[PDB]
Symmetry: C7
Subunit: 72 residues, 7 copies
């Protein structure tokens, strides 16, 4: 069964859209991840209900709030 985590691994260094719980979303470049699916994005923006609320050079996201991750 292909493993879901290997799909993040294949996405390293590329732009991705990350959907979090609560209508929050992140767009940035994936530079790291772990088992719990905690993520690290470089050059990213935080969207809150279709609206940009902040841009940061780096963010560490708790896997607990991740709904899905897909390469852009």
């Amino acid at each position: 069964p292909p493993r879901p985590l290997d799909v993040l691994n294949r996405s390293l260094k590329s732009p991705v859209i990350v959907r979090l719980k609560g209508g929050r979303e992140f767009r940035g470049t994936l530079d790291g991840y772990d088992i719990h699916m905690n993520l690290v994005l470089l050059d990213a923006e935080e969207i809150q209900n279709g609206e940009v609320v902040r841009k940061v050079g780096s963010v560490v996201i708790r896997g607990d709030t991740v709904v899905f991750v897909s390469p852009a």
Copy 2:
């Protein structure tokens, strides 16, 4: 009989994935693990019943899944 075995015979075949909140995904199943994290290819994100996006790859966190059903 085991549930994951069902996901197995659904590999490289169309499925419907309902998530918490009402969000839905229709795509080709490419992978899964024991926690039921999933990977879909050529999928359509569907909110409220309308195609809100079209991604060719998505990793979905198990915690968010309510159910997975093969395509009619």
Copy 3:
């Protein structure tokens, strides 16, 4: 008697599965695991006491389950 054993007794028989939120599934119990994930053949999703979806089969994540009982 243990919970998982009462499930086994329900195989090949119709069951009602309530989920968090309030939705339900009516179908034939074809399988399950320790996590309480389940498989239903010829099932219907039910919201407010009315059918909203018919599926040849479904895998339901144990985590979303509230209860399972024979129909």
Copy 4:
């Protein structure tokens, strides 16, 4: 004294099991485990007094359980 031991001596006895969302179940306690998943026989599903349905048996997920109490 152990909470699960109280459950043990209540086997085959009638009990009320309250779930989250104000839902309750009235039946005979037939089984349970560490996580507090329960098995009730000849149980009445109650919602604000009125009976939703009655079942020969029901498997209830520990997660949705608020409490259990006799009801002689």
Copy 5:
């Protein structure tokens, strides 16, 4: 030192148990375990200054508990 130990100090003495949702249980602490499940005897369920239910004994799932304290 350890939280449960201070809970042991209360065996056979009345306590207050605040549940998730805002409800409370007042009763005699007869037992408990590591999951923090509780056993209360001759207890009352409380909702906004009023006793909404009486039970001769009740087993509460640790999961739904916010805190436990001796009588005020």
Copy 6:
């Protein structure tokens, strides 16, 4: 890397402020804790919506409800 739990230890027998899920709060003296952050406070007080609601001699707080702990 300094460890959160050790900083928490340096606060034993000292007044702390504990924020719980849902705006609830506790102000009391830190007496114990475990790895999951289950806590024990002596001479504490509950606070809801900005107002005191009760005073307890001791209270055990479930870790999963805690948001943060800080010296008063």
Copy 7:
């Protein structure tokens, strides 16, 4: 460069910490563990864009954190 590696690079540096429920903390990152529990120094609790508390030190349960960002 997993998650925890990024957090280490931020020790003794100021960070933004978003919590579930709207609350936000801003301060120097003094510590962390695998559970992602955090220790901040000279931090402000922010809610609705207004400082609602100034603390010399705060320990945050990892399960309550949404994300951590170097500021």
